[PDB]
Amino acid sequence: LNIHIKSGQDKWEVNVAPESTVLQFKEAINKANGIPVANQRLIYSGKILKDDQTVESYHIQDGHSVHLVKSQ
Amino acid sequence: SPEFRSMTAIEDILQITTDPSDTRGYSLLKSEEVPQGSTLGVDFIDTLLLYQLTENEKLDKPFEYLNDCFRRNQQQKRITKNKPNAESLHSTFQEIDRLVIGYGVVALQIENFCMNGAFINYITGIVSNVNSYTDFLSQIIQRAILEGTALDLLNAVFPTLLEYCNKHVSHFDLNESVIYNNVLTIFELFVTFKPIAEIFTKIDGFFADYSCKPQDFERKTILGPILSLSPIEAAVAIRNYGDNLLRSKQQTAMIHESLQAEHKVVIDRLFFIVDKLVRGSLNSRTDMISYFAHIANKNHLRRADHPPFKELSSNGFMSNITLLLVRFSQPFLDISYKKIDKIDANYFNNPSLFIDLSGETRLNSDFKEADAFYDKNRKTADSKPNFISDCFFLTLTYLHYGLGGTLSFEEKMGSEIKALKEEIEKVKKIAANHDVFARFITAQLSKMEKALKTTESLRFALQGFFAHRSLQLEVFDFICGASTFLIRVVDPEHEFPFKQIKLPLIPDQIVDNADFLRAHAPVPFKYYPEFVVEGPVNYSLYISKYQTSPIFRNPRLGSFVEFTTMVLRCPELVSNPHLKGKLVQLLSVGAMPLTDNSPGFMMDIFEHDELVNKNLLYALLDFYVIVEKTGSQFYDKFNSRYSISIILEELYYKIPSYKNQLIWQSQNNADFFVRFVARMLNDLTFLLDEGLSNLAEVHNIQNELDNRARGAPREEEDKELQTRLASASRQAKSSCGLADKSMKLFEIYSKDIPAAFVTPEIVYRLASMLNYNLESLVGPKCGELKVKDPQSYSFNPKDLLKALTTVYINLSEQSEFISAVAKDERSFNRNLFVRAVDILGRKTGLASPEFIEKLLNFANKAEEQRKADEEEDLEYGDVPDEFLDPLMYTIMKDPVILPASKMNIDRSTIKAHLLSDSTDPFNRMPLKLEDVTPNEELRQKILCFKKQKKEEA
Ligand SMILES: [K+]
Question: Does B110 sit within 8 Å of A69, measured CB to CB?
Answer: yes
Distance CA A67, CA A8 (A): 9
Instruction: Nearest chain A residue to B153 by CA: give it.
Output: A48
Question: Going by C-beta distance under 8 Å and a sequence separation of 6 or more, which residues neighbour residue B768?
Answer: B685, B824, B826, B827
Question: Going by C-beta distance under 8 Å and a sequence separation of 6 or more, which residues neighbour residue B271?
Answer: B324, B327
- Measuring CA to CA, how many Å separate B769 from each of A29, B224, B689, B860? 104, 64, 12, 20
Amino acid at B49: L
Nearest to B321 by CA among B389, B187, B219, B226: B226
Question: Going by C-beta distance under 8 Å and a sequence separation of 6 or more, which residues neighbour residue B780?
Answer: none
Question: Going by C-beta distance under 8 Å and a sequence separation of 6 or more, which residues neighbour residue B704?
Answer: B711, B712, B713, B715, B721
Q: Does A53 touch chain B (CB under 8 A)?
A: no
Instruction: Nearest chain A residue to B47 by CA: give it.
Output: A65
Question: Residue B919: helix, strand or coil by DSSP?
Answer: strand
Question: Going by C-beta distance under 8 Å and a sequence separation of 6 or more, which residues neighbour residue B240?
Answer: B231, B255, B258, B259, B457, B460, B461
Q: Is B491 left (phi over 0), alpha (psi -120 to 50) or beta?
A: beta
Question: Residue B436: helix, strand or coil by DSSP?
Answer: helix
Question: Residue B362: helix, strand or coil by DSSP?
Answer: strand
Distance CA B629, CA B454 (A): 44
* CB B214, CB B207: distance < 8 Å: no
Distance CA B796, CA B781 (A): 14
* CB B325, CB B395: distance < 8 Å: yes
Question: Residue B303: helix, strand or coil by DSSP?
Answer: helix
* CB B198, CB B285: distance < 8 Å: no
Would you give the distance in Å from CA B484 to the centre of its chain? 18
Distance CA B657, CA B663 (A): 10
Question: Going by C-beta distance under 8 Å and a sequence separation of 6 or more, which residues neighbour residue B488?
Answer: B340, B345, B494, B495, B496, B497
* CB B565, CB B612: distance < 8 Å: yes
Amino acid at B137: L
Question: Residue B356: helix, strand or coil by DSSP?
Answer: coil
* CB B927, CB B918: distance < 8 Å: yes
* CB B935, CB B904: distance < 8 Å: yes
Question: Does B55 sit within 8 Å of A8, measured CB to CB?
Answer: yes
H/E run at residue B897: strand B895-897
Amino acid at B92: T
Count CB-CB contacts under 10 A for residue B872. Answer: 10
Indicate the resolution in Å. Answer: 2.4
**Which residue ranges make up each domain of chain B?**
1-877, 878-953
Distance CA A11, CA B643 (A): 87
- The b/e string for B415-443 (b: 16+ C-beta within 10 A; e otherwise) is eeeeebeeebeeeeeeeeeeeeeeeebee
Q: For the packed helices B249-280 and B282-297, what is the interaxial angle rounded to 10 degrees? A: 130
Task: Enumerate long-range contacts of B626-631, CB under 8 Å, 24 or more apart.
Answer: B626/B571, B626/B577, B627/B577, B627/B580, B627/B581, B628/B679, B630/B577, B631/B577, B631/B578, B631/B581
Distance CA B763, CA B756 (A): 9
* CB B232, CB B249: distance < 8 Å: no
Give residues after which chain B gaps, C-N over 2.5 angstroms. 510, 631, 713
* CB B942, CB B895: distance < 8 Å: yes
Question: Going by C-beta distance under 8 Å and a sequence separation of 6 or more, which residues neighbour residue B308?
Answer: B301
Question: Does B46 sit within 8 Å of A46, measured CB to CB?
Answer: yes
Would you give the distance in Å from CA B540 to the centre of its chain? 6
Q: Does A61 touch chain B (CB under 8 A)?
A: no
Question: Does B113 sit within 8 Å of A65, measured CB to CB?
Answer: no
Q: Is the dihedral of CA B588, B590, B596, B599 positive or negative?
A: negative
Task: Enumerate long-range contacts of B670-678, CB under 8 Å, 24 or more apart.
Answer: B670/B756, B670/B759, B671/B510, B672/B508, B672/B618, B672/B621, B672/B622, B673/B621, B673/B756, B674/B756, B674/B759, B674/B761, B674/B762, B675/B625, B676/B621, B676/B622, B676/B624, B676/B625, B677/B756, B677/B757, B677/B762, B678/B761, B678/B762, B678/B765
State in Å: Cα B496 to ligand 1 middle: 7
Amino acid at B628: E
Question: Does A70 sit within 8 Å of B102, measured CB to CB?
Answer: no
Q: What is the DSSP string of B184-217?
A: HHHHHHHHTSHHHHTTGGGSTTSSPPSS--GGGH
Cα dihedral B281/B287/B288/B289 (nearest 10): 110
Question: Residue B649: helix, strand or coil by DSSP?
Answer: helix
- Measuring CA to CA, how many Å separate B183 from each of B75, B126, B127, B187, B942? 27, 9, 6, 7, 101
Count CB-CB contacts under 10 A for residue B765. Answer: 17
Planar angle of CA B251, B254, B256, nearest 5 degrees: 110
Q: What is the DSSP string of B217-259?
A: HHHHSTTHHHHT--TTSHHHHIIIIIT-TT--HHHHHHHHHHH
Choices 3.30.450.40, 1.10.10.10, 3.30.40.10, 3.90.600.10: CATH for B878-953 = 3.30.40.10
* CB B154, CB B205: distance < 8 Å: no
The helix, strand and coil proportions of chain B, stated in percent and rounded to the nearest 5, come to 65, 0, 30
Distance CA B834, CA B841 (A): 11
Instruction: Nearest chain A residue to B49 by CA: give it.
Output: A46
Interface of B with A in 30-69 (CB under 8 A): 46-47, 50, 54-56
Planar angle of CA B896, B897, B898, nearest 5 degrees: 120
Q: What is the DSSP string of B808-860?
A: HHHTTT-HHHHHHHHH-TTT--HHHHHHHHHHHTTSTTSS-HHHHHHHHHHHH
* CB B535, CB B396: distance < 8 Å: yes
Distance CA B431, CA B437 (A): 10
User: SS in 3 state form for chain A?
Assistant: CCEEEECCCCCCCECCCCCCEHHHHHHHHHHHHCCCCCCEEEEECCEECCCCCECCCCCCCCCEEEEEEECC
Nearest to B687 by CA among B612, B773, B563: B773
Ordered domains of chain A (ranges, CATH): 1-72 (3.10.20.90)
State in Å: Cα B497 to ligand 1 middle: 5
Cβ-in-10-Å burial (0-12, 13-18, 19+) of B142 comes to middle
> Smallest CA–CA separation between B319 and chain A, in Å?
40
CB contacts of A41 in chain B (<8 Å) are 110
